[PDB]
Amino acid sequence: RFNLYGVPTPHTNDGRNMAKTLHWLHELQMKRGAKIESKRADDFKEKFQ
Amino acid sequence: QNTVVQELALANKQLLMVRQAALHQLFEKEHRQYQQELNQMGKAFYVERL
Amino acid sequence: MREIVHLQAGQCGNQIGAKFWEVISDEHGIDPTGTYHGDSDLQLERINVYYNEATGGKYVPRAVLVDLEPGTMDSVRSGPFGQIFRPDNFVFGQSGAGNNWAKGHYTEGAELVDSVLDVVRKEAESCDCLQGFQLTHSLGGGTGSGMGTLLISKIREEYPDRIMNTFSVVPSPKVSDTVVEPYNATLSVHQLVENTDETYCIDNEALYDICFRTLKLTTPTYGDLNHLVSATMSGVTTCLRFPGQLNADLRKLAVNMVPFPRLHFFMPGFAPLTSRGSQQYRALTVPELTQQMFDAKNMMAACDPRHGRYLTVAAVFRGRMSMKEVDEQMLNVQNKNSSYFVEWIPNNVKTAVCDIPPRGLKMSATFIGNSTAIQELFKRISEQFTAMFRRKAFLHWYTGEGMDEMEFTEAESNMNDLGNPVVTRGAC
Amino acid sequence: MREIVHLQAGQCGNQIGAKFWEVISDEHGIDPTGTYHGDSDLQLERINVYYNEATGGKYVPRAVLVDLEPGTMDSVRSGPFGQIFRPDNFVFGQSGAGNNWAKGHYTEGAELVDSVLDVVRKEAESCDCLQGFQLTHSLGGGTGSGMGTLLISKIREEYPDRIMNTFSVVPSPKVSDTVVEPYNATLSVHQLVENTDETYCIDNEALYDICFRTLKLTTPTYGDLNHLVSATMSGVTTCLRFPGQLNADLRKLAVNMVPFPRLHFFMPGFAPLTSRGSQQYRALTVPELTQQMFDAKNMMAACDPRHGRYLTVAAVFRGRMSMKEVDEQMLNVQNKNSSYFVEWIPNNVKTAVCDIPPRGLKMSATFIGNSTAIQELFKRISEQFTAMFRRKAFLHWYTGEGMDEMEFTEAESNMNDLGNPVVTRGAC
Amino acid sequence: QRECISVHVGQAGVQIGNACWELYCLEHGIQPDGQMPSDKTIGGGDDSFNTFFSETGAGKHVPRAVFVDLEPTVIDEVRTGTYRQLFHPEQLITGKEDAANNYARGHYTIGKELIDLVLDRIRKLADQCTGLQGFLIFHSFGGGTGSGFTSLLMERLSVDYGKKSKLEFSIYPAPQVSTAVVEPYNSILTTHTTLEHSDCAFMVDNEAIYDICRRNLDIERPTYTNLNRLISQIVSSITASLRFDGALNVDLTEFQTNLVPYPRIHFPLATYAPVISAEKAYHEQLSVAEITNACFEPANQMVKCDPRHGKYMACCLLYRGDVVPKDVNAAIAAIKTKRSIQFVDWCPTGFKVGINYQPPTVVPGDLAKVQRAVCMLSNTTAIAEAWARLDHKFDLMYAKRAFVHWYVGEGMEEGEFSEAREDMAALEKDYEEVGMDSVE
Amino acid sequence: SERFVFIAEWYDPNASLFRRYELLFYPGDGSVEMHDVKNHRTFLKRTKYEDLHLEDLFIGNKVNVFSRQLVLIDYGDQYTARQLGSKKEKTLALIKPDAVSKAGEIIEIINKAGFTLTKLKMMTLSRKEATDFHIDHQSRPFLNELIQFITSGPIIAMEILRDDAICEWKKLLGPANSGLARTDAPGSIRAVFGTDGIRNAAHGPDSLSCAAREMELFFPSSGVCGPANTAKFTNCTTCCIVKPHAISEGLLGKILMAIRDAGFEISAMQMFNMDRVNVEEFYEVYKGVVSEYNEMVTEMYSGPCVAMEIQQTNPTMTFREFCGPADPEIARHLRPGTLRAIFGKTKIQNAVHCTDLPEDGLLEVQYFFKILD
Amino acid sequence: PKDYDIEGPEEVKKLCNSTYCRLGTHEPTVWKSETHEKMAQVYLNTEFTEIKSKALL
């Protein structure tokens, strides 16, 4: 008889949602760790990029 | 004792600068050798527009 | 050196500026308690632009807070970055707002403006070279409109040599949060034409179509929506706070950005923006930054650029980048959209760049736009005003509060006489 | 090390004194057996204002219990606080009061006054520095009127430099409980003019009015009436006994309370008189205390303060309390009711504060008020005296006990001669 | 060495002194029992505590004051509270009969049983007193004790100690608020006889500190403890330059020379800066210029008199803490430049500067912890309004002999009432004579 | 809904006065809200603060609310007493000088039981301090060999929280005589890790007053506890800081296992709830040499952290190489045997923190084992 | 809520006692003066500069 009934809409009042979406995902990956690609990708982009 | 405390502050700052210089040198050298061994292994770091 | 005084009026202005102070504190390194904890020495380069100090390195913001309802004051004080402000700057008043321009202008709203000007006067005399004042307010409603325009008037009379930035949220076409929004908007823009040096019209619907079409969020609240406003308020005042090649402050923006003194209503913009899923598939570079400026789905004023020629376009970049890229990119924008850019101002684009980008971002940029597209906003407000005025509706509480008939027609005539130049220079 | 010699006369006097002693014994921490069982030393520090020390911790009240009929003494000794008094201080007489001022003043009353003098002298030189004497009695009736005035005169002649406070129960207009209230009251006031230094007239109708209307009792008893009067009596002699800041005693209040020597007739009030059903709801504070003090509702002589300007005002507050809130409210009432104060005197209020409230309460205020509005209390008794003195009625008892005819005329002449200046100062 | 004797009279004076010596003890590091935990601190070496606290072989730092009151229970509060062991038993003199708010009882009849004992105590404290700089008299112009025992005390101290300095810190009767009806009697008949015997008398009021605590200290329901703890701050800024070291060492004898231009006009007006309430003081600058302008703002005066309605005749500023003289110079030049501080034309040099290197110490209470402070004492003509209004009160009360009988039957003759009134007429005549500019 | 309301305390750096607050926690959706005690007003209105979990709420914890490192004082309201009261209880652990090298897996079994550690110290027991821990044993003919054990070597001591913590740690401890424990074979700490009755594994209190008095004889409220064995400068005294993320996930025991089975020896451990000024002083050398500094610092003063010193005895591989690269993803693509390679993540949640300069390890141990208590 | 009910069912009615004993129902009587309490904030209510910036050297 007594519970919260209705569809829940997850939302953060203070602004954390826009706070996370205005941080670039490359920076978050960088903070999780250094990004690592292949040696020939490094060589190709060192020469011709 | 007042000028002794000032002197401890100055010694703190001096060791701060010399420690920061040594730590910067060590981090640069570590980064260089990490990149060298990764190139030996077959991978490499990603630098923005490298 | 140079300083800006941050005034905030109304509930909307108080919340927007509180989130602004959160953003500026995060950008400069000031914690919620107020003590400087940054990572670079160059964050404290130009800390005087927004913060006065105290004893012990405690930086208090140079902000003056006012409203008629002492509950938004408690909300801002109990916010996260709430115990940083000056407690004597919390200029409240035990009265009512009642979203009434008369009640905020000619009466109990004006019964507090003496104390407000006392606080503003001490904060302005405690400076050496003040550049000006930025006020955050709601164009529709009371307090931010009612006491807001009066505050603009008295500050302009006391200091006639400083830039008045007014970040104002205009009423939206689809929805209204107050049935007398056309009344308050017309009676507020009537003062804003001949007073402030530059406005910033930030519409809610265009503010939120960003949150769909680019950000792809599902349920963003006003705590999310005022963050874009805070990002633009941070990006405008960035070359006088952080070093960079080819600097640009508020008054250089104003002289490069306001051709005629009445035509100073801008549309804002912030465009390193993409959804959380599309962040990793994006090619973040100066050309795509420029394109995301000039696409008509990113700007925060519901005015189509393809409905009117651009008079001036300012672009203040942040981040390490090349100069030939940005110069050729805005030249290419001018050449591609040749018909939508005016011909009597060759190079109608002001460019600026700055060194350090905002934290969590690699390159950002703020966008300022003065076009003939603001005639849609002003004309819609004028049509809705003439709709509510020809039957004298919702007006007895202006007349009983102390407002007379004839300068309603003065305000509407000023609205139409501001619509006249912004359509004559559309066709030269 | 100061003390008060408390004496009471008549059957009204013995009960009012017994309730005063119940209040003081409860306040200090004295049980009905007499030993001290309290919780703090601030009580025990200065209990020798009312309690002479004796062996075994048996602190005994220093009271002189006087009446001409030995039945009210049996009632006092059989009451709750009955085994607390000295057995020698019940000075009795196997006679009758007679309801006669002549029987009280020119008869066996004078045969008992020598033993009463012996008792009060035995009390008096068992001391170091005496402040004075405090007699409670009823003007309308025997014993306490006649013997009360005789005893007042004789102990004033014995000790002339000690203060005299007399709590006198004046008669009432609504009811007459005897038929010789006029004769007894006029004849008592004749000695009350040039003898006592500070009288507090306390009518009986006002006691029922306060008990029925403020305390909201339905059948208030003599115990409740004497409880209110004893609360006023205890609150007057407070800072002499309990510690505090800005302390005030009897001679202090007298010097600040009488501008002329014959205008020593006061008009008291105790004012946390909140009803107990509403007691948990009252937000009892200093402005509430002031309003309940200064309304014409709590005043314990049946005479309206609105019928005559106040001469001088006392306010002996008790408790932990802020004196900004005290004295700003004091000027609030003084400046709001300017027509109710005589203007030749400025600042006509005394403030006194004890740091300890009466137990059971936290904030209290006793009011002692000299007003020209005490004139009606004597106009009533004057017309009531002459209407039954012109026809020589109820007079043969007075002239057959050994008192001359002309003393009635002398008493009425002295009484309206006291009526003259408290009229002529109330209208400049 | 450089030590001054405090005297405290009445309820008001005695609990001036209670908070004053609380603050003195926590300034010099002295424990409430009477000892010090350890030396080797700037507050308690020798030269700073020798000013107030004497010494003893068993580490006891006995006060140099007298706490005299004609009635008990306030002295008994002092010797029952936490400072029982500190004050000496004869150092706190109590009577056995209250003065009853009568100047006649304060001066003429019950003064003779205690004046000999008080002079004996003051003679003893002056005997163990190497360089006596002066007596600091703390009392009110209100109740009987501070009205009359002081009036006798200045006379006796002028008889026996004629060349010495006397600095009164007087509670003046407030413009509106009051605590009595015979304050117009007592203040006039006290000032009449202490005008020729008091060297300098800073008058601090009550309603002005009421407004100060209401407006700056952000406390709507405060008491006498919060009221005169600020006066303890005042005296701790007055008599501190001889305790510690600083840029300018201002002496107790310098205050009377710099603030008293004429023999009868010796009535300065006191004010204090940082009076902020510790959740507001750390969002402001509190620079030297701001704390200088705070004293001269016409709301921070600690007596309710408006400096605009008058002209300054002398001003002394006592700066305290990490204050620099070259911001002191800029602040005083700025306050001299603007018009509303209108000085008289017969002292263009109207400022005294005294700088102390000791930051103010916060008591456990309501004032903030600050590193800068200034106490400003201004002798001005604006006190003539308050004096003329007090004379109006006296004339309205005396025109029909109100409360005369209590005074005259106590021992005082009637002619003293007329004599004090014309003394006040001469005082306000001198005040209006020193007002206008020179034209000769 | 379901308020857990506590008495909290802060030191204002500017206002040198202890400031008293009243913290509200809604587990619910997890939100926090203080209240000013003096000058009764609002303070940080109810908003979600996911950094503040439920399990750190504990009397004496030093929880990091917004830039404010608030120390808990009292229950205040007693609904939260009668709910999160007896669900946490004091326990003192005293791992004896035998198997003090096995203390890593002692700690692992402690944290596997479900315990929470609050402070951790190794000392040696002095004369009077060792005699204090024998008043329960007194006047029975074994005191001399008890003294010989408890003053033989170092002792690692612990404070432990759980519901029914005393009895449930007795269940983990087993019967007092380890010979009887071996006859029973219950897998107790004495039965698996023990020698005899005189040297069992670790002593524990048997009542609440026992826990209180042995806690006071040990980790005190005054400031003198023991020498806290370091052998301060032994020509190679690098330090490690096992992080709050590590000792909240429970990786502390396995960290000690790995650093004990690598030739290295621990000789000094101390768990110290740090404040921001001391954390800033320690990491002050990291101003501007590493890009992410502030959010490394806030991890350091987020929760408890345990310092230790490591004497270098392992050849070829030193302590810096055994800790590995600072970045754990980098360390995983590197030598996959180091502590940060197999024990950490996200470059800030490194399980360990070694002294980066080789000549400067002595100064770190002179700090987190001498300057700071 | 009184103590001595005059209308209460009791055969003996001494009409000399009040219906109450104390005028109010305040539980704590404090028994502490202002110059005793506010002057006692030095032996208690202490908070000095405890948290100090410990120098690394």
Ligand SMILES: Nc1nc2c(ncn2[C@@H]2O[C@H](COP(=O)(O)OP(=O)(O)OP(=O)(O)O)[C@@H](O)[C@H]2O)c(=O)[nH]1
């Ligand atoms: N800080 C503080 N100021 C006080 C205090 N008491 C009185 N004052 C001021 O002093 C004035 C009267 O005090 P006194 O003159 O000392 O009273 P008194 O001399 O003892 O006179 P009586 O006791 O009535 O004979 C009041 O008007 C107050 O303004 C106090 O307790 N603390």
Ligand SMILES: Nc1nc2c(ncn2[C@@H]2O[C@H](COP(=O)(O)OP(=O)(O)O)[C@@H](O)[C@H]2O)c(=O)[nH]1
């Ligand atoms: N961007 C933004 N807009 C807001 C916020 N709060 C309110 N508003 C806008 O403010 C408008 C009404 O403000 P108003 O009633 O005038 O506030 P008042 O001045 O205090 O009466 C609404 O149309 C809202 O769209 C906010 O937090 N962020």
Ligand SMILES: Nc1nc2c(ncn2[C@@H]2O[C@H](COP(=O)(O)OP(=O)(O)O)[C@@H](O)[C@H]2O)c(=O)[nH]1
């Ligand atoms: N307040 C109060 N009034 C009383 C008490 N006892 C008697 N009175 C009043 O005293 C009046 C008559 O008393 P009175 O005849 O003068 O007593 P007597 O002089 O001893 O004969 C009556 O009108 C009563 O109202 C009492 O105990 N308390």
